[PDB]
């Protein structure tokens, strides 16, 4: 793993520190543009908060000599100090060093640079792009609310960034009475710093959303030229938003458009072939139940069945071995016979009051219940003489399949059940290959008494 006293790329405290470094980077996205357009020299409320953020980013850049990294040509986790150090000093060392310099110290170098110096603090905005790539290749995060939250952040950052540039064009003017803001409120240089920001954001949003009331428009030619490039940029930006919002609606209404496309087919099918008014309802019940059952991960065979037979045999073994072992028939049969008996066994669901086995039928299959219940009703001259009821983890149809005689009792569900089905041919094959069938028939005649 690692040397004494050192740090790793996936370690928890490192991901937690890094998420707090992303909230600090979202606070310098708001503050860096605002100190460039709206302020000239460090004022108290931010002169200390930005130094706090600077100390935190200095702590981070000095902790990056003690952090692992991962090659994309070897994929080995390189954790040797004299090598991560050089890869840090490769590209992002002094770029991340200028991005944390106390601006009060850049003032003594020169005035006129405060707003422009703290504008390269937007270099520490690569972290948001990193986080947004990681969250959207990750699969624990909904791709809808991870991509749709990136188009909210770059739209709120263009609106905010253009609102501080367009105000700085007006604040740096001479005779601030023919400006965009100095034309509506003449005395705008003595106003609450929150009113200036509100009326700049207002213009930005009207223009970005193409409402364009008409109050707050360009007045000079310097502002017209800015506005020509902002509306060019906005036109391109909104086209791409509308594109991304269709890529997230047609891929969002698939699993419902595929269902009414099935109940429709199941009605044309029953219409062509003239099914009596007893099979169409059964078909529709089993197709519905399928949507609820496979809306969850309880049922999936469209793609889970495209796996190999050595993968789908580990899954169906892990899910049902504990169940298959607790059946009276296969008491002490073997170690592998149970494995291949549970390997080729197809699980199915059944709606309530849906008899899986009719009396006097031809004994094709036998089922093993997994969950739910049912009752062994028999049809006689006096019908509806319900005798017993099975539970989860029991086997039905066994006497007509191991002796080849018509089924004697009809089992009818009374709850959404899940059974395991095995044909007569398959079972007879896999047990005909072996010797342990003596134990099976002995358990059978033991059950009979």
């Amino acid at each position: 793993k690692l040397r004494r006293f050192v740090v790793s790329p996936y370690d928890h405290k490192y991901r937690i520190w890094e998420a707090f470094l992303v909230v600090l980077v979202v606070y310098t996205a708001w503050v860096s543009p605002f100190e460039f357009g709206f302020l000239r020299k460090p004022r108290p409320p931010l002169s200390i908060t930005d130094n706090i953020v600077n100390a935190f980013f200095a702590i981070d850049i000095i902790m990056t000599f003690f952090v692992g990294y991962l090659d994309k040509s070897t994929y080995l986790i390189v954790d040797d100090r004299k090598q991560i150090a050089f890869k840090y000093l490769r590209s992002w060392f002094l770029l991340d060093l200028v991005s944390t310099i106390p601006s009060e110290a850049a003032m003594r170098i020169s005035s006129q640079s405060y707003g422009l110096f703290n504008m390269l603090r937007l270099w520490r905005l690569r972290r948001v792009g990193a986080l947004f790539a990681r969250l959207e290749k990750d699969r624990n995060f909904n791709y809808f609310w991870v991509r749709c939250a990136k188009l909210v952040c770059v739209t709120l950052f263009a609106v905010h960034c253009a609102a501080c540039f367009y105000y700085l064009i007006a604040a740096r003017n001479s005779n601030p009475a023919k400006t965009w803001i100095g034309a509506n409120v003449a005395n705008f240089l003595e106003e609450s710093l929150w009113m200036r920001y509100v009326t700049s954001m207002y213009w930005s949003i009207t223009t970005l959303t193409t409402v364009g009331y008409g109050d707050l428009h360009p007045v000079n030619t310097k502002e017209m030229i800015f506005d020509i490039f902002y509306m060019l940029f906005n036109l391109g930006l909104t086209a791409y938003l509308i594109g991304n919002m269709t890529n997230l609606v047609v891929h969002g209404t698939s699993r419902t458009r595929n269902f009414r496309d099935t109940i429709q087919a199941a009605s044309n099918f029953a219409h062509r072939n003239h099914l009596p008014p007893r099979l169409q309802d059964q078909m529709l019940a089993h197709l519905c139940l399928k949507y609820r059952t496979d809306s969850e991960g309880l049922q999936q065979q469209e793609t889970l069945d495209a796996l190999p037979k050595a993968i789908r045999s580990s899954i169906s073994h892990f899910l049902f071995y504990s169940l298959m072992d607790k059946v009276y028939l296969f008491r002490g049969v073997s170690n592998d016979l149970l494995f291949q008996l549970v390997s080729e066994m197809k699980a199915e669901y059944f709606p309530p009051k849906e008899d899986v086995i009719l009396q006097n039928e031809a004994p094709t299959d036998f089922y093993i219940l997994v969950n739910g219940t049912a009752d062994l009703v028999d049809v006689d001259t006096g019908t509806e003489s319900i005798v017993r009821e099975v539970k989860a983890g029991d086997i039905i149809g066994e006497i007509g399949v191991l002796c080849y005689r018509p089924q004697l009792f009809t089992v009818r569900t009374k709850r959404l059940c899940q059974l395991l089905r095995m044909n007569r041919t398959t079972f007879l094959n896999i047990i005909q290959a072996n010797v342990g069938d003596g134990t099976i028939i002995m358990n059978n005649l033991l059950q009979h008494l």
Binding site: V211, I242, N268, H286
Partner: protein, 473 residues
């Protein structure tokens, strides 16, 4: 017939058959109950309007809108004493639970009951006699906003309609957008008027700049001004005659037209998805036909060949269509077998080869038959082919072809219910014919090494007589 009964959106007729109907219980899928639910939902459309309206305008709550809230708060008070007599359906059992002491404590334990009683309270009416006046002020009006809890009933209807196939998915999908976008026009025009009405200086507002005496005019003048502003902003026209003046209006206004970006991108993304899927089929049929005409034009082919190619491609797309109604493959084997034993039982019972056969083996055959369809002149079995399968024709026709090296002569014509391709299967020789369809046919296949193993290894009853039936043929 319970899942069948609960799949119709507006419910279905419940008759004296009494399969689940017990005394003193209303079944939730009954048609009377669903019509009553639709009634309450068209009253919800009134309560969504009248509740936002009285928040913003506040001189409406004195007139004829306070005996309409009392009549509508009555039909919602009898739907609370009637939700103790209504069935429900588990999502872990699917049994229709209709026992009172179990209905009467899933309503109680739910948020629905406390919210339905906190919505149906005539607060403004009880306040009107236990005090002297109607409620008034900034914060008192935030009390009929509790009746926006009933929008959950409109969220229901537009969810049990997008699954009923009896209803057009374009009509209801488009209607949900109408209802959502004009509730929000109305919601936003009532909030901006509410902001202007309660502002200290009545002339630094969006409406007090235009109509100086706006607080003393009719409520339907302020309403029309607010709805006009709201719609020239939502649609993004923005004449700019009415616009935000102070910073409370600028702030709500620029939160309003930020959500408008999402709303109008969503309306567009939905209308460009109900137009792009309303054409995929037609594009495939037109994509296919377009080249045929291109090929019949670039070369100077007669028009008869173009009436042949087109008719055949139409018949081919008909098969490709009606063969996608094959839904019966994921259903459990019991229901699939009971359906097959209705479609193809008398076809396979009488086919000159399954004549003297055990019932068990007949069922073992019928349970597995997957039927396929074929366009009118495709060859399903080429001559001298490996005998992999053989077919049984349920309806349609096929011809028997015997190529002479240089010919193809129709030896015989087979119709419904007669086996095609059995000779090479039973003899294990290369298939000594060529069966090609003549009409649009449906055939059921019986593969080799599936029929042979089943007739050979398993059963001990059938013997020695199917060879006598084959040498008879």
């Amino acid at each position: 017939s319970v899942s069948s009964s609960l799949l119709p959106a507006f419910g279905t007729f419940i008759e004296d058959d009494n399969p689940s109907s017990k005394p003193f219980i209303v079944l939730h899928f009954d048609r009377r109950y669903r019509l009553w639910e639709l009634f309450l939902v068209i009253l919800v459309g009134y309560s969504a309007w009248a509740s936002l309206f009285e928040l913003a305008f506040e001189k409406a709550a004195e007139g004829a809108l306070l005996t309409i809230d009392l009549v509508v708060d009555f039909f919602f008070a009898v739907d609370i004493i009637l939700t103790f007599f209504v069935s429900y359906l588990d999502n872990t059992t699917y049994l229709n639970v209709t026992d009172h002491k179990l209905i009467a404590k899933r309503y109680l334990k739910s948020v629905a009951f406390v919210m339905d009683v906190a919505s149906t309270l005539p607060i403004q009416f009880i306040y009107k006699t236990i005090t002297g006046d109607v409620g008034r002020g900034q914060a008192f009006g935030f009390l009929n906003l509790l009746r926006l809890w009933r929008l959950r009933r409109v969220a229901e209807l537009f969810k049990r309609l997008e699954k009923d196939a009896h209803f057009n998915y374009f009509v209801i999908r488009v209607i949900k957008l109408l209802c959502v976008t004009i509730f929000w026009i109305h919601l936003a025009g009532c909030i901006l008027y509410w902001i202007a009405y309660h502002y200290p200086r009545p002339t630094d507002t969006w409406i007090g700049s235009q109509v100086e005496d706006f607080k003393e005019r009719s409520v339907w003048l302020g309403y029309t001004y607010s709805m006009y502003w709201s719609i020239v902003t939502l649609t993004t026209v923005g004449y700019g005659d009415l616009h935000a003046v102070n910073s409370r209006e600028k702030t709500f206004n620029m939160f309003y037209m930020l959500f408008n970006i999402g709303l109008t991108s969503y309306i567009i993304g939905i209308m460009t998805n109900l137009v792009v899927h309303g054409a995929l089929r037609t594009f495939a049929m037109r994509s296919a036909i377009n080249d045929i005409l291109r090929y019949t034009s670039k070369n100077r082919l007669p028009d008869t060949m173009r009436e042949q190619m087109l008719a055949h491609m139409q018949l081919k797309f008909k098969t490709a269509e009606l063969r996608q109604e094959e839904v019966l493959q994921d259903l459990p084997k019991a229901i699939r077998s009971s359906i097959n034993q209705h479609l193809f039982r008398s076809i396979i019972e009488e086919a000159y080869l399954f004549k003297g056969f055990p019932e068990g083996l007949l069922v073992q055959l019928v349970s597995q038959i997957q039927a396929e369809y074929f366009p009118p002149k495709m060859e399903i079995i080429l001559q001298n082919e490996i005998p992999t399968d053989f077919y049984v024709i349920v309806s349609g026709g096929v011809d028997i072809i015997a190529s002479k090296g240089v010919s193809e002569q129709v030896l015989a014509k087979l119709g419904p219910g007669s086996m095609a391709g059995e000779i090479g299967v039973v003899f294990n020789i290369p298939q000594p014919f060529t069966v090609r369809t003549r009409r649009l046919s449906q055939v059921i296949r019986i593969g080799h090494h599936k029929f042979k193993e089943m007739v050979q290894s398993d059963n001990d009853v059938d013997a020695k007589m199917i060879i006598a039936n084959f040498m008879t043929y």
